[PDB]
Design an enzyme around this catalytic site. Structure first.
Site, short mmCIF file in Angstrom:
data_model
loop_
_atom_site.label_atom_id
_atom_site.label_comp_id
_atom_site.label_asym_id
_atom_site.label_seq_id
_atom_site.Cartn_x
_atom_site.Cartn_y
_atom_site.Cartn_z
N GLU A 239 0.85 -1.15 0.15
CA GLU A 239 0.24 -0.35 0.05
C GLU A 239 0.51 1.63 0.36
OE1 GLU A 239 -2.70 -0.31 2.84
OE2 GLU A 239 -4.41 1.26 2.23
N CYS B 187 -1.00 10.26 3.87
CA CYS B 187 -1.27 9.89 3.06
C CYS B 187 -2.76 9.99 2.36
CB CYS B 187 -1.04 8.56 3.02
SG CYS B 187 -1.97 7.53 3.47
N1 LIG Z 1 -2.00 3.99 4.06
C1 LIG Z 1 -1.03 4.76 2.40
O1 LIG Z 1 -1.12 4.10 1.06
C2 LIG Z 1 0.16 4.92 3.02
C3 LIG Z 1 0.36 5.30 4.24
C4 LIG Z 1 1.18 6.06 5.20
C5 LIG Z 1 2.62 6.09 4.12
N2 LIG Z 1 2.28 5.99 2.82
C6 LIG Z 1 3.28 6.62 2.25
O2 LIG Z 1 4.49 6.35 2.89
C7 LIG Z 1 4.85 6.89 2.06
C8 LIG Z 1 5.89 8.04 3.93
O3 LIG Z 1 6.55 6.69 4.30
P1 LIG Z 1 8.23 6.43 4.22
O4 LIG Z 1 9.26 7.74 4.51
O5 LIG Z 1 8.15 6.14 5.44
O6 LIG Z 1 7.93 5.15 3.27
P2 LIG Z 1 9.47 3.98 2.90
O7 LIG Z 1 10.59 4.20 3.16
O8 LIG Z 1 9.87 3.44 1.58
O9 LIG Z 1 9.83 2.59 3.91
C9 LIG Z 1 8.87 2.62 5.30
C10 LIG Z 1 9.09 1.23 5.84
O10 LIG Z 1 9.97 0.08 5.01
C11 LIG Z 1 11.42 -0.12 5.82
N3 LIG Z 1 11.73 -0.11 4.68
C12 LIG Z 1 12.51 0.80 4.19
N4 LIG Z 1 13.68 0.03 3.24
C13 LIG Z 1 14.02 -0.70 3.48
C14 LIG Z 1 14.70 -2.12 3.04
N5 LIG Z 1 15.23 -2.21 2.00
N6 LIG Z 1 14.60 -3.90 3.77
C15 LIG Z 1 13.40 -3.92 4.56
N7 LIG Z 1 12.08 -2.73 5.28
C16 LIG Z 1 12.23 -0.95 5.05
C17 LIG Z 1 10.92 1.37 6.65
O11 LIG Z 1 12.14 1.09 7.97
P3 LIG Z 1 13.48 1.88 8.13
O12 LIG Z 1 12.89 3.58 8.16
O13 LIG Z 1 14.32 1.54 9.25
O14 LIG Z 1 14.15 1.72 7.36
C18 LIG Z 1 9.93 1.70 6.82
O15 LIG Z 1 9.52 1.56 7.89
C19 LIG Z 1 4.72 8.31 1.63
O16 LIG Z 1 5.17 8.52 -0.16
C20 LIG Z 1 3.46 8.23 2.34
O17 LIG Z 1 2.45 8.25 0.84
C21 LIG Z 1 0.89 5.75 2.36
#
Ligand SMILES: NC(=O)c1ccc[n+]([C@@H]2O[C@H](COP(=O)([O-])OP(=O)(O)OC[C@H]3O[C@@H](n4cnc5c(N)ncnc54)[C@H](OP(=O)(O)O)[C@@H]3O)[C@@H](O)[C@H]2O)c1
Ligand SMILES: C/C=C/C(=O)SCCNC(=O)CCNC(=O)[C@@H](O)C(C)(C)COP(=O)(O)OP(=O)(O)OC[C@H]1O[C@@H](n2cnc3c(N)ncnc32)[C@H](O)[C@@H]1OP(=O)(O)O
Ligand SMILES: C/C=C/C(=O)SCCNC(=O)CCNC(=O)[C@@H](O)C(C)(C)COP(=O)(O)OP(=O)(O)OC[C@H]1O[C@@H](n2cnc3c(N)ncnc32)[C@H](O)[C@@H]1OP(=O)(O)O
Ligand SMILES: NC(=O)c1ccc[n+]([C@@H]2O[C@H](COP(=O)([O-])OP(=O)(O)OC[C@H]3O[C@@H](n4cnc5c(N)ncnc54)[C@H](OP(=O)(O)O)[C@@H]3O)[C@@H](O)[C@H]2O)c1
Lengths: 678, 678
Positions: free
Chosen positions: A255, A294
């Site tokens: 998602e 989001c």
């Molecule tokens: N319901 C929805 O659609 C929804 C809800 C909330 C947020 N979002 C979207 O999420 C984005 C913001 O959140 P974000 O910056 O945290 O996204 P993200 O940078 O892609 O990371 C999301 C999660 O994945 C983990 N992760 C990252 N790289 C990884 C890897 N190589 N292996 C395993 N796990 C990994 C991160 O942990 P680490 O920090 O330790 O790397 C984090 O907990 C925005 O674009 C927003 O639109 C969508």
């Protein structure tokens, strides 16, 4: 200072390379996180051999009472959560959502799963599928809980909501969860998990937490596990093609980010009340939670003759927003969470400014302050269908772009050109513009709000995911679904089609079905308490002859002088051939045949579930009723003053002298218990 | 000789390197296939811009009538299909299952969609979700149809069943389809598609075929498309990670091979009728279609003290099977489809013989004859819990292995050790054994048959997928689902939670909801025909005062002398406080207020859908009824003699002088039409 992880029942901590958590309004490190050198296979092994058999030995009603008890325990000590949430740069109203709307999801699931889920370990979702000519072979569907773990990977926006909306269907379904939050705001997630664990309400092993990287967890999962992801669209497409996940074929629910439109209709002029609530909705949804939700409005589609009326009315509403510290007074918008977020928002703003325009304080952002502030930003794009970078880039902050359209056939294409969105809004007053918008723009969206004067008084908003509406969307928004009501507890279960005789399906499902054996036991079934009823207790009533006088007496007393019952010339020209007995008189004489008169355990009736009349009943025709217990599903006695009770469903079958079933149906009843529980 | 592919409205053929189709019982080559140089983007272009709006402009009832007409057109010219199917090496009793089950799938998906789908383009699946305290804000779920294509990839087993069980939910959901059959037996799929296209029943662009390799189709898709795969695991795990599918996040439904079990219960001794039907079911399911169906029994779990008797009876039952040409008389088992299949079954048999044993004619298969035959093989494994190659390697022929267990707790582990299966069987006569089997072994199976003496007379079989039962399985079986009833037309649709006022949701869904505006017309709604009822037509009836004599008259006429209506001492000690009017008298006296007594369009009533009693009605309490039209949903007039009609649903709401809603519900009605359609 270390941040601990709850693995194998113990609070542990890592050794080695580490990241660290800054304060949001000042900017110093006040935690540091690591998860190196910890055993993940032993954590999954402890979860499977400890927390899964304890959850799979409960009924659904006990698993909902557990959620209500955990919710009442977490609501009381809520003020140690606002203190941690203020460190993330949020205000008080923007933390009220994260705390209280995430705790209210538990109350919502506890109220849903107690009224609509059975008192059993299995859950039969269908009624019966007759697959034979005589009635000796049938089938029905069952839902049984998986015997693995649910691995959740959250984001940094809602540490209290986003952990805990994935956790009510996981515990209600029957699986133990392992939470991996984002390492930028994990200090609230750990406080939530510690308040869950240190109360003795959930079984041991039913929850685990990792702070830091997972490392070697997805390479150990089995095909009875599920994985849920929440993050950007670049990480989830790397975790989808992980070779153990595509080898063992485990469910992965991705998602991701989205671009959420907000379309103004052609029937709106600036003198109407629609325009002011349009501007109010756009400004509130763009400034709430510092633009870091989001479901925020990022593309504003307005008609061509109303651009200058909108772009002048937004900015005058937006210049009154005072960005600063949330603890000091006069400040409405808080800060971001990191300096990396302040860099990453502006590097997307520059990509939008490579082909866009400027209306307010945009790319100006102080990139050296001690605090993650970003000013509210309104952009403009005069060529909407010739600039694909608008429809593919989301600046995850207070930034939103504005663009025009031409008479409800260009707006319906600019709203669908987002490539799969998560939410949408239309502001109209004509109910035949909303029909044309839903019939063409509900494919790309997963939730659409129509806004007018009546709806705006008690609307929840564009960006509030309700726990009983589907949260998801196609294409760029991942492609998964969450929070659909009871649709979300079925992501943690296996659906099976069970076939056999009806007397075998009844013993498997613990509910009498239609063809199973009965148990006639010499005393009346309305004289038993709740603890001595079994599904299959049957009563065969005495007979009653339907005469010509009964039709006249019922039509006089009720008032239904319908022509198929009172006329004789017109009755010989209808489908029945002659005049017949009322259906409600058969329904009433049946209840006169089976209902006991004395004071006993039966308290109320209050329900009739599904009635179908099959063959007509004529004068000179007898009636005999069969009454069978079907389903028991007790209630929980929420106080000590109240009476112990449960709700029994009885199947009623009426038949004539030829034993053919006229008018078969099913009723509900509230039967008192002998022994209370609370 | 070419094999033509129907693309973009034209029968085309490839130019390049080719594969070729042999004859299964003799050995000569008689077709050859290729698809080189065909334009695969133009076929998707033609299906999207030409065939999809022709399907998305029909209603669901017309799309069901289309399926019924295509089924009646293809049932007539079936004698060419048996002649094409005899070239595949199958008997008449095996080709009958394929052809007639394929057409019965269309009849079932027409008869379900005729009864349970609306007369609309959109489909509301919920009732209403009240999200407010006053009543000016609610939400409900809609299902709209996607705007792309459905790429179906099939296997070589059922060329007529496997195409047409994916195509009926696709056409009922309103999407076009591009079928890629397996090129080992693609001569029957083309005859199917040619008989469909050359009738003028389906729209143009609504069906396409590709004979040969797809080549470059999966690099051209979009997020509004779906892909279904049916085949082996090693191919579908290579097509799952295709970099367009994971980038656009399109739905991919894989369904793969399985090791299906058949467990014998401990309470079954050879002096019982269960034993003979166990042997009959195993032998029939292993010798049907030469063991070339995915739902065939491949592991036989028997108790330890019954290995020798089962191993004697299976061999004494299997040696009566004659393997040869199907056209000559006295031949039961046919042949395989290719010499590659004969060469690839035995390389699995040798892998099983690297650790197992031998009971019958296994690896001594003549690999040089004309016509691909294989002898019925039975194997044995004395150490099942130590040899993992039995639980992971499938031989896709007449081969099945046998192994013992120890008293209903080792058999429940050997049945789950397969790693997720597709079907399963228990043969018992004790229903508690069946309860224990379902409570532990339904996590890995997607369909379980319990078999005894009552069920065996009309059981459809272990390996026959019914079109209204879920066909799928977890883990190794892929994880997808098909044929779930109306659960499969929701794979071609998008679900959307629409929010707003009820007078806006009523205009979007074309059904009156609860709080929408009404339209009173000063003539009675039971006087209008079906073509002039609109959803929203309301009647407000006159009042009736519930006196004390009405309780006595209804209790005497029905016979319900319940203590809350007749006794006065015990009514003051109950929950109500005093004695109250019956519920069924409220139901019968509400119907006397809105029914027109004269002859008109209304024919029958026959139904009552959801009745709930809310507040108790007392003596001295007035009653007034509101009656509103809700949903129309016409019927298709299956003859030219029958009167045209539809089924109108009304919503009834009763209230007292304080206007609080006592006892609200909904009824069904069969209302005649003015102008017939056929
Ligand atoms: N319901 C929805 O659609 C929804 C809800 C909330 C947020 N979002 C979207 O999420 C984005 C913001 O959140 P974000 O910056 O945290 O996204 P993200 O940078 O892609 O990371 C999301 C999660 O994945 C983990 N992760 C990252 N790289 C990884 C890897 N190589 N292996 C395993 N796990 C990994 C991160 O942990 P680490 O920090 O330790 O790397 C984090 O907990 C925005 O674009 C927003 O639109 C969508
Ligand atoms: C690999 C694949 C393997 C297989 O699929 S083998 C499948 C083996 N199963 C069977 O043989 C059927 C089992 N039977 C059941 O389960 C049986 O419960 C059953 C499926 C009859 C139940 O009876 P139904 O009435 O429900 O059968 P259908 O739904 O298929 O057809 C009903 C419908 O079809 C129409 N119709 C007309 N001619 C035909 C014909 N000729 N065939 C079908 N339908 C027809 C007819 O107008 C009827 O009109 P309505 O009832 O008013 O809707
Ligand atoms: C990113 C995140 C965004 C958001 O989440 S914003 C969410 C915004 N939504 C809201 O603010 C709520 C809007 N209201 C609706 O939608 C409303 O349809 C609604 C949610 C009341 C609908 O009413 P419900 O009955 O579904 O609400 P609850 O089930 O939570 O409360 C009733 C229930 O909860 C129990 N209970 C006890 N204390 C509480 C407390 N303190 N809170 C809740 N429930 C409680 C109580 O015993 C009651 O018991 P029963 O009725 O016998 O089942
Ligand atoms: N419902 C079920 O679970 C189910 C039903 C039926 C069969 N099966 C399983 O299917 C197996 C038998 O079928 P099968 O041998 O035909 O499977 P397969 O050979 O592995 O391939 C299945 C399909 O994939 C296509 N394909 C192969 N390689 C491809 C590539 N590189 N790109 C695109 N498409 C490709 C094939 O087309 P070509 O033939 O033209 O190469 C064929 O149509 C058995 O194991 C059986 O258990 C399962």
């Amino acid at each position: 200072q270390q941040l601990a992880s709850f693995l194998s029942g113990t609070w542990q901590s890592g050794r080695g390379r580490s990241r660290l958590i800054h304060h949001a309004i000042s900017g110093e490190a006040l935690w540091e996180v690591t998860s190196e050198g910890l055993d993940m296979a032993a954590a999954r092994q402890f979860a499977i051999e400890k927390g899964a058999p304890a959850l799979r030995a409960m009924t659904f009603i006990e698993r909902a009472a557990m959620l209500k008890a955990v919710a009442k325990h977490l609501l009381s000590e809520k003020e140690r959560f606002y203190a941690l949430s203020a460190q993330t740069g949020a205000t008080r109203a923007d933390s009220w959502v994260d705390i209280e709307g995430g705790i209210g999801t538990l109350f919502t699931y506890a109220s849903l799963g107690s009224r609509e889920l059975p008192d059993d370990t299995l859950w039969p979702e269908d009624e019966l599928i007759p697959l034979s000519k005589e009635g000796g072979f049938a089938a029905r569907h069952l839902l049984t809980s998986k015997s693995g773990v649910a691995v959740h990977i959250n984001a940094f926006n809602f540490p209290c909501w986003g952990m805990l909306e994935k956790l009510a269907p996981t515990w209600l379904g029957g699986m133990p969860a392992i939470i991996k939050p984002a390492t930028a705001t994990a200090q609230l997630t750990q406080a939530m998990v510690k308040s869950i664990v240190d109360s003795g309400l959930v079984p041991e092993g039913a929850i685990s937490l990792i702070c830091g990287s997972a490392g070697d967890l997805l390479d150990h999962l089995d095909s009875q596990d599920v994985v849920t992801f929440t993050g950007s669209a670049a990480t989830g497409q790397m975790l989808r093609v992980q070779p153990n996940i595509v080898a063992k074929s485990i469910p992965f629910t991705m998602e991701a980010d989205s671009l959420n439109c907000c379309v103004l209709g052609e029937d709106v002029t600036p003198d109407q009340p629609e325009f002011a609530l349009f501007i109010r909705e756009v400004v509130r949804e763009m400034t709430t939670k510092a633009g870091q939700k989001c479901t925020a409005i990022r593309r504003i589609i307005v008609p061509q003759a109303l651009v200058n009326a909108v772009s002048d009315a937004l900015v005058a509403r937006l210049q009154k927003v005072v960005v600063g510290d949330p603890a000091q007074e006069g400040v409405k918008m808080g800060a971001l969470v990191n300096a990396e977020q302040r860099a990453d928002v502006q590097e997307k703003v520059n990509i939008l400014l490579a082909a866009g325009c400027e209306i307010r304080l945009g790319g100006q952002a102080d990139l050296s302050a001690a605090g993650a502030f970003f000013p509210p930003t309104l952009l403009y794009c005069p060529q909407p269908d010739e600039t694909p970078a608008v429809h593919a880039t989301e600046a995850f902050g207070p930034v939103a772009t504005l663009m025009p359209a031409q008479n409800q056939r260009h707006a319906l294409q600019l709203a669908c050109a987002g490539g799969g969105s998560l939410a949408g809004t239309l502001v109209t007053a004509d109910p035949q513009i909303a029909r044309q918008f839903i019939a063409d723009a509900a494919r790309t969206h997963g939730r659409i709000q129509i806004l007018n004067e009546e709806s705006a008084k008690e609307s929840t908003g564009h960006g509030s995911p309700l726990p009983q509406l589907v949260h998801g969307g196609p294409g760029r928004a991942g492609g998964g679904e969450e929070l659909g009501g009871l649709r979300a507890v079925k992501h943690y279960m296996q659906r099976t089609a069970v076939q056999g005789s009806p007397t075998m399906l009844a013993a498997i499902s613990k509910q009498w079905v239609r063809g199973a054996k009965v148990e006639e036991d010499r005393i009346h079934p309305f004289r038993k308490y709740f603890e001595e009823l079994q599904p299959g207790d049957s009563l065969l009533t005495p007979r009653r002859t339907m005469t010509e006088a009964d039709i006249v007496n019922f039509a006089c007393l009720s008032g239904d002088h319908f022509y198929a019952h009172m006329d004789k010339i017109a009755a010989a020209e209808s489908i029945f051939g002659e005049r017949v007995v009322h259906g409600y008189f058969v329904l009433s004489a049946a209840a006169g045949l089976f209902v006991d008169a004395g004071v006993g355990p039966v308290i109320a009736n209050y329900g009739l579930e599904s009635l179908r009349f099959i063959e007509p009943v004529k004068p000179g025709d007898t009636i005999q009723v069969r009454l069978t217990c079907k389903r028991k599903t007790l209630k929980k006695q929420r106080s000590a003053e109240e009476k112990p009770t449960g709700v029994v469903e009885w199947a009623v079958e009426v038949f004539n002298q030829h034993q053919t079933p006229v008018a078969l149906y099913s009723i509900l009843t509230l039967v008192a218990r002998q022994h209370g529980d609370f």
